[PDB]
Protein backbone atom coordinates (compact mmCIF):
# COMPACT_ATOMS: atom_id res chain seq x y z
CA UNK A 1 0.00 0.00 0.00
CA UNK A 2 0.86 3.67 -0.42
CA UNK A 3 1.62 6.03 2.49
CA UNK A 4 -0.91 8.74 1.67
CA UNK A 5 -0.32 11.27 4.44
CA UNK A 6 1.69 11.68 7.62
CA UNK A 7 0.98 13.34 10.96
CA UNK A 8 2.78 13.96 14.23
CA UNK A 9 1.09 14.79 17.54
CA UNK A 10 3.94 14.76 20.02
CA UNK A 11 3.54 18.56 20.14
CA UNK A 12 0.11 18.69 21.73
CA UNK A 13 0.94 20.41 25.03
CA UNK A 14 4.12 22.30 25.93
CA UNK A 15 4.76 23.58 29.43
CA UNK A 16 8.12 25.34 29.31
CA UNK A 17 10.39 26.62 26.57
CA UNK A 18 13.94 27.64 25.76
CA UNK A 19 15.79 29.37 22.94
CA UNK A 20 18.75 28.28 20.82
CA UNK A 21 20.07 30.40 17.96
CA UNK A 22 22.08 29.52 14.86
CA UNK A 23 24.91 31.52 13.33
CA UNK A 24 27.21 31.54 10.33
CA UNK A 25 30.10 29.07 10.26
CA UNK A 26 54.39 43.92 12.14
CA UNK A 27 52.75 46.87 10.43
CA UNK A 28 54.74 46.65 7.19
CA UNK A 29 53.77 43.01 6.68
CA UNK A 30 50.21 44.01 7.56
CA UNK A 31 50.16 46.45 4.63
CA UNK A 32 51.09 43.82 2.06
CA UNK A 33 49.06 40.90 3.42
CA UNK B 1 54.01 62.87 -15.84
CA UNK B 2 54.19 64.85 -12.61
CA UNK B 3 53.07 63.56 -9.24
CA UNK B 4 50.04 65.73 -8.38
CA UNK B 5 47.27 64.04 -10.39
CA UNK B 6 48.95 60.71 -9.70
CA UNK B 7 48.76 61.54 -6.02
CA UNK B 8 45.12 62.59 -6.32
CA UNK B 9 44.21 59.26 -7.87
CA UNK B 10 46.32 57.09 -5.55
CA UNK B 11 45.19 59.10 -2.49
CA UNK B 12 41.52 58.81 -3.37
CA UNK B 13 42.02 55.12 -4.16
CA UNK B 14 44.12 54.35 -1.05
CA UNK B 15 41.44 56.06 1.02
CA UNK B 16 38.93 53.97 -0.95
CA UNK B 17 40.89 50.81 -0.13
CA UNK B 18 41.27 51.89 3.49
CA UNK B 19 37.52 52.30 3.22
CA UNK B 20 36.98 48.72 2.06
CA UNK B 21 39.43 47.51 4.72
CA UNK B 22 37.55 49.44 7.39
CA UNK B 23 34.34 48.15 5.81
CA UNK B 24 35.32 44.56 6.42
CA UNK B 25 36.80 45.05 9.90
CA UNK B 26 34.09 47.38 11.29
CA UNK B 27 31.16 45.55 9.70
CA UNK B 28 32.60 42.36 11.17
CA UNK B 29 33.19 44.25 14.43
CA UNK B 30 29.46 44.49 15.19
CA UNK B 31 28.20 41.65 12.99
CA UNK B 32 30.65 39.22 14.59
CA UNK B 33 29.58 40.75 17.91
CA UNK B 34 26.09 39.40 17.20
CA UNK B 35 27.63 35.93 17.17
CA UNK B 36 29.11 36.73 20.61
CA UNK B 37 25.74 38.12 21.81
CA UNK B 38 26.54 41.78 21.12
CA UNK B 39 30.18 41.03 21.96
CA UNK B 40 43.61 45.42 14.16
CA UNK B 41 42.32 49.00 14.26
CA UNK B 42 45.92 50.15 14.81
CA UNK B 43 47.47 49.42 11.40
CA UNK B 44 44.14 50.58 9.91
CA UNK B 45 44.78 53.88 11.68
CA UNK B 46 48.40 54.01 10.52
CA UNK B 47 47.47 53.46 6.88
CA UNK B 48 44.73 56.05 7.34
CA UNK B 49 47.26 58.63 8.52
CA UNK B 50 49.37 57.70 5.51
CA UNK B 51 46.37 58.36 3.28
CA UNK B 52 45.53 61.70 4.86
CA UNK B 53 49.11 62.97 4.80
CA UNK B 54 49.52 61.85 1.19
CA UNK B 55 46.26 63.52 0.08
CA UNK B 56 47.39 66.70 1.82
CA UNK B 57 50.69 66.40 -0.06
CA UNK B 58 48.68 65.77 -3.22
CA UNK B 59 46.95 69.12 -3.10
CA UNK B 60 50.26 71.04 -2.92
CA UNK B 61 51.78 69.79 -6.16
CA UNK B 62 48.74 71.02 -8.08
CA UNK B 63 50.26 74.43 -7.20
CA UNK B 64 53.47 75.15 -9.11
CA UNK B 65 56.02 77.93 -9.14
CA UNK B 66 54.83 80.22 -11.91
CA UNK B 67 57.09 80.20 -14.95
CA UNK B 68 56.77 82.22 -18.11
CA UNK B 69 58.27 82.92 -21.53
CA UNK B 70 58.92 86.31 -23.36
CA UNK B 71 56.29 87.39 -25.88
CA UNK B 72 58.50 89.05 -28.50
CA UNK B 73 61.29 86.48 -28.64
CA UNK B 74 61.00 83.14 -30.37
CA UNK B 75 63.76 81.43 -28.39
CA UNK B 76 62.71 79.88 -25.10
CA UNK B 77 64.33 82.37 -22.70
CA UNK B 78 62.11 80.98 -19.95
CA UNK B 79 61.06 83.62 -17.40
CA UNK B 80 60.85 82.31 -13.82
CA UNK B 81 59.46 84.40 -10.97
CA UNK B 82 60.30 81.80 -8.32
CA UNK B 83 56.76 82.45 -7.06
CA UNK B 84 53.69 80.26 -6.55
CA UNK B 85 50.88 82.85 -6.54
CA UNK B 86 50.00 86.22 -8.04
CA UNK B 87 50.22 89.28 -5.81
CA UNK B 88 47.84 92.14 -5.07
CA UNK B 89 49.84 95.39 -5.12
CA UNK B 90 49.19 97.01 -8.49
CA UNK B 91 52.72 98.39 -8.85
CA UNK B 92 54.51 95.04 -8.77
CA UNK B 93 51.59 93.27 -10.41
CA UNK B 94 52.17 95.72 -13.23
CA UNK B 95 55.80 94.57 -13.00
CA UNK B 96 55.05 90.97 -13.77
CA UNK B 97 53.20 92.09 -16.89
CA UNK B 98 56.09 94.42 -17.81
CA UNK B 99 58.54 91.52 -17.70
CA UNK B 100 56.61 90.74 -20.85
CA UNK B 101 56.56 93.48 -23.48
CA UNK B 102 52.78 93.63 -23.08
CA UNK B 103 50.29 96.22 -21.84
CA UNK B 104 46.94 95.09 -20.36
CA UNK B 105 45.53 98.37 -21.57
CA UNK B 106 46.15 96.81 -24.96
CA UNK B 107 43.91 98.09 -27.73
CA UNK B 108 43.79 101.71 -26.52
CA UNK B 109 47.53 101.89 -27.00
CA UNK B 110 47.62 100.03 -30.29
CA UNK B 111 44.43 101.17 -32.06
CA UNK B 112 43.88 98.02 -34.19
CA UNK B 113 41.20 99.56 -36.40
CA UNK B 114 43.12 102.35 -38.10
CA UNK B 115 46.50 100.58 -38.22
CA UNK B 116 45.43 97.22 -39.67
CA UNK B 117 43.95 98.27 -43.02
CA UNK B 118 47.17 99.97 -44.14
CA UNK B 119 49.25 97.39 -42.26
CA UNK B 120 48.03 94.42 -44.31
CA UNK B 121 48.54 96.21 -47.64
CA UNK B 122 51.97 97.56 -46.89
CA UNK B 123 53.12 94.40 -45.12
CA UNK B 124 52.30 92.17 -48.08
CA UNK B 125 54.16 94.62 -50.35
CA UNK B 126 56.96 94.89 -47.80
CA UNK B 127 57.57 91.21 -47.28
CA UNK B 128 57.23 90.68 -51.03
CA UNK B 129 60.29 92.90 -51.14
CA UNK B 130 61.84 90.92 -48.24
CA UNK B 131 61.20 87.62 -50.06
CA UNK B 132 64.79 87.96 -51.27
CA UNK B 133 65.62 88.71 -47.62
Question: Looking at the partner chain, which of A23, A24, A27 has a beta carbon nearest the beta carbon of B43?
Answer: A27
Q: What resolution in angstrom units was achieved for this structure?
A: 4.3
Residue B13 burial (CB count, 10 A): 12
Q: How many CA atoms lie within 13 A of B91 on its CB side?
A: 0
Name the structure determination technique.
cryo-EM
DSSP line for B34-101: HHTT---HHHHHHHHHHHHHHHHHHHHTTS--EEE--SS-SS---EEEEESS----HHHHHHHHHTTT
Nearest-Cα distance to chain A for B45, in Å, is 11
Return the sign of the alpha-carbon dihedral for residues A27, A31, B3, B7: negative
Q: Is residue B68 within 8 Å of B100, Cβ to Cβ?
A: yes
Nearest to A30 among B34, B35, B43 (CB): B43
Amino acid sequence: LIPVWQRDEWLTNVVDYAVLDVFDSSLWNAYWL
Amino acid sequence: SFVSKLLYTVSALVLFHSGFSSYEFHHLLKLNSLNNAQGLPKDIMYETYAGLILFVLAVFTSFEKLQYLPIESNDGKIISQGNYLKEIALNKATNVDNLIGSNPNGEIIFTPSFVDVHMKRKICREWASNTVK
